[PDB]
Amino acid sequence: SFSGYLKLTDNVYIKNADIVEEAKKVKPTVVVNAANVYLKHGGGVAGALNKATNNAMQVESDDYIATNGPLKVGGSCVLSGHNLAKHCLHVVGPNVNKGEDIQLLKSAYENFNQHEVLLAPLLSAGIFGADPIHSLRVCVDTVRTNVYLAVFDKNLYDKLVSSFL
Known part of the structure; x- marks a missing residue:
C-alpha cells in the first residue's frame, strides 16, 4: 500500500511525490485528478495523469462530456483509472486564475467523502491559483475518509508540513 507518508490527522497523510509515479507504484482504488x-x-x-495513460483518459473524458455536458465547479465524476488506478475521481476545484469562487473548494473536497481511500493532489493548488496552505486546511476540515496527498514540489511540501496547525 502507501509508504513514506507523514500523518497530519486521523485520516489525512502527505508525501513529497509525483502523483503519476505514486499512482503507478501503488495502483490505488482511486486516484483524484485536478480536473476542469x-x-x-x-x-x-x-x-x-492524462499523458501517463497515453491519452486514454482524454478519449474517455471527451466521450463523457459529449454524453453528459460539463461538470460543475465543485463537482466530480468517476471514470476509469486506466494504468494508474482502478478509478479516477475527476474533481473540479475553483480556478482562482479564472475568477472562480474559492468557497467552492470545500464542495470540491466533499467529493472525496464518497471514497474510503484516495490518492490525491491538493485541490485548486498549482496552476489553479489558490493558496496550497489554505487547500490543505480545507482538506483536513472537510475530508473524513483516508486521503493520501501527493505534493509534487519539495519546497511547497516542506512549507505545508512546517506550517500545518
Missing part, C-alpha cells in the same frame, strides 16, 4: 469542468487534461496534474 470540460475534462480537458492540458496541464498540471491533469496533463501529467
